Amino acid sequence: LPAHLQQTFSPEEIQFIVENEPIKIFPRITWQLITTDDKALNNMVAMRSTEVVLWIALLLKQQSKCSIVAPQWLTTKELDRKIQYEKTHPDRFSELPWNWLVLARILFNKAKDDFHDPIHELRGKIQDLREIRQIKVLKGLKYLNESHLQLDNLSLLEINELRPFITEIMDKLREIHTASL
Amino acid sequence: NGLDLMSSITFSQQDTNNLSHQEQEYLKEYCDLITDLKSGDLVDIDLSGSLVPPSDVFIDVRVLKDAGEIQTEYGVFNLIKDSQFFVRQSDVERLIQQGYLQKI
Amino acid sequence: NTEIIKSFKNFILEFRLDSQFIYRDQLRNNILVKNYSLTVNMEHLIGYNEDIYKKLSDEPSDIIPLFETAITQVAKRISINSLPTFQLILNSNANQIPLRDLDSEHVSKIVRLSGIIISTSVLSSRATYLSIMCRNCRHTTSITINNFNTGNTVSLPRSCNCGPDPYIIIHESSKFIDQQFLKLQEIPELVPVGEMPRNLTMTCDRYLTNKVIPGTRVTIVGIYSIYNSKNSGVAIRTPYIKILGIQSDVETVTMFTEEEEEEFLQLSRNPKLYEILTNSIAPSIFGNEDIKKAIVCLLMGGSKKILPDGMRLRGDINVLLLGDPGTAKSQLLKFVEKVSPIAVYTSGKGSSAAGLTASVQRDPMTREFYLEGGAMVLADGGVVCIDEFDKMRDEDRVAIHEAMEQQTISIAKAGITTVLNSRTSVLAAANPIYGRYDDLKSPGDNIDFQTTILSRFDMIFIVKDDHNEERDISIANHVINIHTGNANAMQNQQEENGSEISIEKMKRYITYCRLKCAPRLSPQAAEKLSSNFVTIRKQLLINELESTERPITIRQLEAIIRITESLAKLELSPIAQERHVDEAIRLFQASTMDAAS
Amino acid sequence: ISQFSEAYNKILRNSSSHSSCQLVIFVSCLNIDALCATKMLSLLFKKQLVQSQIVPIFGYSELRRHYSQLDDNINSLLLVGFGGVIDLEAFLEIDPQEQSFRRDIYVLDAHRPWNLDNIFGSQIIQCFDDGTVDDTLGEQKEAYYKLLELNDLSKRKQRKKQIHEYEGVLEEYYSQGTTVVNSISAQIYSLLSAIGETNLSNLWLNILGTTSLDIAYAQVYNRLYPLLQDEVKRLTPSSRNSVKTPDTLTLNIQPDYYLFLLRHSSLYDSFYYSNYVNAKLSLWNENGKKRLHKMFARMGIPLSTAQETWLYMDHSIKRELGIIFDKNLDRYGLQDIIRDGFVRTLGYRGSISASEFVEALTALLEVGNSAQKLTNLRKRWVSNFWLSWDALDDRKVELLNRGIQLAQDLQRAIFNTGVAILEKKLIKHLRIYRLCVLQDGPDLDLYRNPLTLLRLGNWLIECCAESEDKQLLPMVLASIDENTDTYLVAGLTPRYPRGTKKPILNNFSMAFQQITAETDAKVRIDNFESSIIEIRREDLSPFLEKLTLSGLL
Amino acid sequence: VSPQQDFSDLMKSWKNERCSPELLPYPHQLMKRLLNRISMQSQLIENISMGFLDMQNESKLPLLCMETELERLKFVIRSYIRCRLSKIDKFSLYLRQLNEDENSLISLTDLLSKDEIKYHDTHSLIWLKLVNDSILKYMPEELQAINDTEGSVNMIDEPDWNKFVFIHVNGPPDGENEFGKPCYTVTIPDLKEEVELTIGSIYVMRYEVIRDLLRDDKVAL
Numbered sequence A: 001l002p003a004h005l006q007q008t009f010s011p012e013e014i015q016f017i018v019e020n021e022p023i024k025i026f027p028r029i030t031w032q033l034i035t036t037d038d039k040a041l042n043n044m045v046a047m048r049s050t051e052v053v054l055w056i057a058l059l060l061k062q063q064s065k066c067s068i069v070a071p072q073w074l075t076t077k078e079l080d081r082k083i084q085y086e087k088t089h090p091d092r093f094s095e096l097p098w099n100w101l102v103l104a105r106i107l108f109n110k111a112k113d114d115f116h117d118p119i120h121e122l123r124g125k126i127q128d129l130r131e132i133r134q135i136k137v138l139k140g141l142k143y144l145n146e147s148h149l150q151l152d153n154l155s156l157l158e159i160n161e162l163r164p165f166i167t168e169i170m171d172k173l174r175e176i177h178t179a180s181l
Numbered sequence B: 001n002g003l004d005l006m007s008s009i010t011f012s013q014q015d016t017n018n019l020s021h022q023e024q025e026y027l028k029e030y031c032d033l034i035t036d037l038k039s040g041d042l043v044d045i046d047l048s049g050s051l052v053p054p055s056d057v058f059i060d061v062r063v064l065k066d067a068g069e070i071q072t073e074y075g076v077f078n079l080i081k082d083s084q085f086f087v088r089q090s091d092v093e094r095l096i097q098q099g100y101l102q103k104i
Numbered sequence C: 001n002t003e004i005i006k007s008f009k010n011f012i013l014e015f016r017l018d019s020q021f022i023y024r025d026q027l028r029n030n031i032l033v034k035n036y037s038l039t040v041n042m043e044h045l046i047g048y049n050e051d052i053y054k055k056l057s058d059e060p061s062d063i064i065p066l067f068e069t070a071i072t073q074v075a076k077r078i079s080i081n082s083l084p085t086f087q088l089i090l091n092s093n094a095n096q097i098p099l100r101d102l103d104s105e106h107v108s109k110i111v112r113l114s115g116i117i118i119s120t121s122v123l124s125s126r127a128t129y130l131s132i133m134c135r136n137c138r139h140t141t142s143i144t145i146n147n148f149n150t151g152n153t154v155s156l157p158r159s160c161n162c163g164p165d166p167y168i169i170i171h172e173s174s175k176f177i178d179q180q181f182l183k184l185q186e187i188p189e190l191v192p193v194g195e196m197p198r199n200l201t202m203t204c205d206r207y208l209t210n211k212v213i214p215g216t217r218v219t220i221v222g223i224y225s226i227y228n229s230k231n232s233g234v235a236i237r238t239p240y241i242k243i244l245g246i247q248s249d250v251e252t253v254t255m256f257t258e259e260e261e262e263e264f265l266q267l268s269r270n271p272k273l274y275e276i277l278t279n280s281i282a283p284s285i286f287g288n289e290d291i292k293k294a295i296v297c298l299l300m301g302g303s304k305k306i307l308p309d310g311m312r313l314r315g316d317i318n319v320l321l322l323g324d325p326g327t328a329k330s331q332l333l334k335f336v337e338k339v340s341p342i343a344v345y346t347s348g349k350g351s352s353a354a355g356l357t358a359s360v361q362r363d364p365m366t367r368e369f370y371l372e373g374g375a376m377v378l379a380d381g382g383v384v385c386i387d388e389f390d391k392m393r394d395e396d397r398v399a400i401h402e403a404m405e406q407q408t409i410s411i412a413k414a415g416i417t418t419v420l421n422s423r424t425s426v427l428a429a430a431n432p433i434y435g436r437y438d439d440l441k442s443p444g445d446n447i448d449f450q451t452t453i454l455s456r457f458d459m460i461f462i463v464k465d466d467h468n469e470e471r472d473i474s475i476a477n478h479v480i481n482i483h484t485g486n487a488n489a490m491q492n493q494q495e496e497n498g499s500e501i502s503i504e505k506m507k508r509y510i511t512y513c514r515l516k517c518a519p520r521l522s523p524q525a526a527e528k529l530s531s532n533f534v535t536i537r538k539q540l541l542i543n544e545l546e547s548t549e550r551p552i553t554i555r556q557l558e559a560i561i562r563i564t565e566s567l568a569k570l571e572l573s574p575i576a577q578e579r580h581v582d583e584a585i586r587l588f589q590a591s592t593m594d595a596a597s
Numbered sequence D: 001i002s003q004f005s006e007a008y009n010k011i012l013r014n015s016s017s018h019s020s021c022q023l024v025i026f027v028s029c030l031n032i033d034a035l036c037a038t039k040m041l042s043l044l045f046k047k048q049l050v051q052s053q054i055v056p057i058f059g060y061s062e063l064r065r066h067y068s069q070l071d072d073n074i075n076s077l078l079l080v081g082f083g084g085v086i087d088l089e090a091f092l093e094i095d096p097q098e099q100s101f102r103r104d105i106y107v108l109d110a111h112r113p114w115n116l117d118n119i120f121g122s123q124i125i126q127c128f129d130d131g132t133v134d135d136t137l138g139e140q141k142e143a144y145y146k147l148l149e150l151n152d153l154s155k156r157k158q159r160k161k162q163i164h165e166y167e168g169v170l171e172e173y174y175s176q177g178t179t180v181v182n183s184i185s186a187q188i189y190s191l192l193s194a195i196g197e198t199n200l201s202n203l204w205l206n207i208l209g210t211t212s213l214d215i216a217y218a219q220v221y222n223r224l225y226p227l228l229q230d231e232v233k234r235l236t237p238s239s240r241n242s243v244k245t246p247d248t249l250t251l252n253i254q255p256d257y258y259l260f261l262l263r264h265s266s267l268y269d270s271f272y273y274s275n276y277v278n279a280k281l282s283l284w285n286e287n288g289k290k291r292l293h294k295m296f297a298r299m300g301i302p303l304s305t306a307q308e309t310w311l312y313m314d315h316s317i318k319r320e321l322g323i324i325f326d327k328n329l330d331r332y333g334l335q336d337i338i339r340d341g342f343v344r345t346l347g348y349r350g351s352i353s354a355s356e357f358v359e360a361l362t363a364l365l366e367v368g369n370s371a372q373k374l375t376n377l378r379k380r381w382v383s384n385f386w387l388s389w390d391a392l393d394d395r396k397v398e399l400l401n402r403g404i405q406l407a408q409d410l411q412r413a414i415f416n417t418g419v420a421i422l423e424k425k426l427i428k429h430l431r432i433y434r435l436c437v438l439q440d441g442p443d444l445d446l447y448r449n450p451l452t453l454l455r456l457g458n459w460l461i462e463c464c465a466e467s468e469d470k471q472l473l474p475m476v477l478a479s480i481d482e483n484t485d486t487y488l489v490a491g492l493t494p495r496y497p498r499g500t501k502k503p504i505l506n507n508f509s510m511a512f513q514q515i516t517a518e519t520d521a522k523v524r525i526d527n528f529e530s531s532i533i534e535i536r537r538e539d540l541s542p543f544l545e546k547l548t549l550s551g552l553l
Numbered sequence E: 001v002s003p004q005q006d007f008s009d010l011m012k013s014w015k016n017e018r019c020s021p022e023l024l025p026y027p028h029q030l031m032k033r034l035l036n037r038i039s040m041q042s043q044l045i046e047n048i049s050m051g052f053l054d055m056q057n058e059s060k061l062p063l064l065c066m067e068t069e070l071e072r073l074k075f076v077i078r079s080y081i082r083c084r085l086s087k088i089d090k091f092s093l094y095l096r097q098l099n100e101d102e103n104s105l106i107s108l109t110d111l112l113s114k115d116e117i118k119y120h121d122t123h124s125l126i127w128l129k130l131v132n133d134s135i136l137k138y139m140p141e142e143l144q145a146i147n148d149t150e151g152s153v154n155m156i157d158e159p160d161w162n163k164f165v166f167i168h169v170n171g172p173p174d175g176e177n178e179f180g181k182p183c184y185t186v187t188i189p190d191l192k193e194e195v196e197l198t199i200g201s202i203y204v205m206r207y208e209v210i211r212d213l214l215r216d217d218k219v220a221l
């Protein structure tokens, strides 16, 4: 019996989920491990790009034996066209890595060192897009009615925290109207 | 429960008499019921603990006036008051439930 | 000048103290609030830029507008009408300054200061924006007061023939704000010398207003300056000071943080939760725990029963400290005032200049009339400390007879007859006549003559100081320990460490509690008590069978009833306990003993 | 007597295990110089993810209460601060166990002389002598190789004289002032630098660790600035700002002062509670008091401005401050204040002097928290210990401010109680040495911490003698509150006014051993620190007479 | 049969699990072999690590790495099991009422793991053992029944399929339900018309109308 949350996913859970996503890195390394579902790999070439699951990358990076690739989608200069595209589209939320919130929080824990001036940089940049995305949630949130929601593009993290909000809502709405029938 | 080696509901649920005997009967019978599921796993579970997802993997815990060492399982960590360790999430999960562990 | 804006905007954005930046958070935090406000940490500000702080400190008044007009900028970014300018409050705790010293040097200098306010003016408007038109040219214009130090700073421009200044006010289109006009006084403790304490008018605007109760101990910041006014010289201007920001010691304010409830819940769980407070009230004090205990029951506030009809139970009771000097009761109430969030210490006469009667006084200008205030009003809904109650002039002493029960004062003075509400809980410390022998006398023949004064009182205490050797030497040495090396004072740390109340938190605890629970007695407690006093009512009359003169009322029992919720309120329980009641009986029994003598 | 790396490499084969490991660092004990070296090492294994115990040992014999308590699977071991004098083969015994022994012990001590049994008889050791004083120190070679294995009556009598010759020689060594060589973290950092790792934190830690004993001379440390100064040269995060940056935001060299709580206090009291300022200016008295104010009259400083926070000092008051110092302080002999010692810069959270950074950590030691009570209280010091270890953490700075403030609370009573003592003239001049005792005072519990009177005594010894002619001398001190005349007695040594020509070491510590080898009634070596001893007032009086004579120095 | 997809669908329904308002069939067909597969390597890795001590008179990276993937994946399944434990407690009356009813599909060992079904009756058993000895004594004749009155009600609940839920449409393309313009599907609510749907967009709606598609696995949640 979970008690809490328990219906919504924990942010610690969803990040625990996003850990499962594969990404390329630059190992210092040159048994097996067989593991289970990895399928990878032959002992990896030092200073070479290879796609691997996220949390394992945290491992060798935790020993600093590996160098994680920066997301191509993660370019602050590149990200402005999104906020550019976002600032000109009051409706659409544009495009998302879909895990990216936890990433940046996690990316800057350790892997921060790999990027060029991530410091004092995207954190603000990402933050602006974070709320401008978030603000557009509530602005469209006034439209909220049963039985349909066009949620479109949103980061699941905020989607998770918003879960208790609307899920508790429309059920009232759907109930009250349908009950009214 | 609570968790090793709980090793028993004894001292746990201090209410005891304060809670109605019919229920303490039920619950004490109920916890034995979930122990039946423990026969099912065979996982191993260990669902009574392991509430938090793993990380990462090692952590530093300090004893809280707890000795010890009761650490017979695996190996003895030699419980000493005012002593922080460096250990993996796995074994910590049991002692943290037993209050012998403090810091993360 | 310009573009210094973005630098704050940078600290508005560029700034992140790891792991999370603040003011940029605070803004959106205030956004949905529609708070239209920001509280700045100035001591934090220097941490960002060292230059702009003193660069701000040079002429802070001029860079005031450089903020809220800037804060809207990204706020407007985050808003994406109409959007009124936010109200910033910057603050610092670092170097506190005495009211005793204000140097003209400090003009246009921001200064954090502690203070004790005399009072504050009723709120009045200031128009942040206005539209104005030529009474002649039909020319359309608009003006704002974007910020100000009252000057008057601005007037109607005379350039529309047409003139002079044909442009005129339009209020409807104009937009407005408020000001409190606080009058603050220095802390009494220091350093008035023989001289009377200076008093100062502090300027509170918009959100600044209504934020502080009159008479409260407060810490405030703002700018020293001078306004010529007119209503001095040659060409001398009167002193005034801006308030920004005011971060006042909490409360010094019904709301509070959530985790506070929990730590109190930790206290509410304690079996000794009441008994520890028995020690907390008297760290320096030794013995008289019964009277010591009798303190707390009144501290939580009395029974308020408003259910129809309009008849309502009062609070909080009455108590008498009467006993030979060396009672330390006046010293006691001095602790009492410190313990009450709102209380008035009165040894009079009145205290200090305060009318023991809330009284009427005329407005100097424009004649008219107003309530001049009274101690009952000053402390209303709270503690009342009284000394020399026997030395009190009996005429306004009469008003006391009313103040305690009906708890509403009314005076016909001039044209204003209105009936004020007084919810205060009074306690009488007045010394008994002729020392010990009055106990050899009737219990009465002390207060005035009649005990009708006592009638309105509830728990009246007669201190018996007996010369017992061991009893004295206990507290006797206890006295020396109170002194250097303050051995007793160091004992409280371990009492603070392990259990014992800090008593300032306790005040917050009580204030928490006082507003929290509304305990209603269990039905069997009353019948336990109904069976009780009926004996006491019957028994003391058995003492009255000798025609012995001393006393009893049904109001005597009702007072006891308020003791029921008293400690029970400390328990926080929704209903009074059966067991809980009993201590009130034996405790009031100790009070009845005073009648027994 | 071995290179650190291979010794560290030696643990590597002994390191990784499941269940791990097994080795246990010993935190021993009170002195912070071990603390930095632990975390750097603590971080070292973090890099390798090496599990192990962390024990904040306090009692000198407490390790015996522990080593004799929990040792099971430990295949390897490292200790700190101890063994440089007394042997654990005697202390533990040991008992050679299985050549290719099952367990080995790294022994950390910066104090000399090393024990005779340390280097030779390599067992758990791994003698820690490397690389400081090898030396030689060729004297220990005759203490064994000559000693071992040791008409015929002539050759027999000829050997014994040679034996007594070496015994007579060996008798001097190991009987001598126990003194620290250098901050252990430095050599550990050398090993840290040996593996190639240099962390601005880690160097800061050396900067931190180096600072630990800085209150007592250097002495090598004076040349150890540059060793660190080279490092600040070895590391330049960027050529220029790059403002702030909001993160790193890193340390830089500054004109540091013996002035206390510089950034963290009003400059006025900053002189007032500064110990170096104390006796030089005779701060306790009213006479020299105004003279400092006279310096502000020289400095052109408003008295209230001295009352002002260092945060808000005018940029003029800032930039001209040292120049004001340049034009003033030298007149009073205050010219040796300014130090180029390094300062961490947290920007938004502010820059801090490691010296100042240290003192806050020092406040953690005594506060921020029958015979069982002392173990209970010593445990509280250990209980209070980790909270101080918590203060080692970087992100947690807010908690530091308590000690940051509490340190200010310390000297307030520190500067308070001592001067009170000054009025009574309680010093016993004697002949051989200056002597003092505290029979009474408020809050001796706070004085129970050795560092309390230690910072106090140092605040005293330099106060009582600047000099203050003639002949700077070791000080006597004792104090008592409860626990039946415990009377903690800590050793004290004279301070030169910036002119330590000689090591001069320690004497009484040997002399304290003279009485502990004597009737030794109620005297207690229970202190890990040789300079500090527990004594009953009842037996200390004769202990004093026994202390007065025989004087070893 | 691929272990990734073996794990993929595991988190699939598991993510759907805590997301899910009510219970779905027990996945013994896969979870068992994994429940066995966990038993294989875990024992294997345990011994090969023991064979590592033999090299002692280097790479532990993959060592605890194996242990890493072990307990982490071992964690999720408890959330899966423990959660199902909860839902059943809430439906137990209906779960019997669904069991008591001929139609349609009983829990069996299909919808419910044998441990689950055992826990079903066992918990439900002593629970009534818990109510009977406590409140029912003191058991009025009509009140003697624990079940539909009808009303209110009880349980009955909670077969509420009507509730809205978070989802993201995704399903394998032929390159079926796609009528355009962009993509599939209907929709066609009881109280509303077609919306409709897109794999490119998350649309929250009635858990009942969507049951078919989560059954199709043509929508993420």
Ligand SMILES: Nc1ncnc2c1ncn2[C@@H]1O[C@H](COP(=O)(O)OP(=O)(O)OP(=O)(O)O)[C@@H](O)[C@H]1O
Pocket (backbone or CB within 6 Å): C284, C285, C286, C287, C288, C323, C324, C325, C326, C327, C328, C329, C330, C331, C332, C429, C431
């Ligand atoms: N219970 C007590 N605890 C602490 N101090 C006491 C107590 N009783 C007497 N004293 C000491 O006796 C002195 C009494 O002085 P104080 O002025 O308080 O008398 P008082 O009772 O307030 O005077 P009055 O009777 O006129 O109101 C104080 O110095 C106080 O310390």
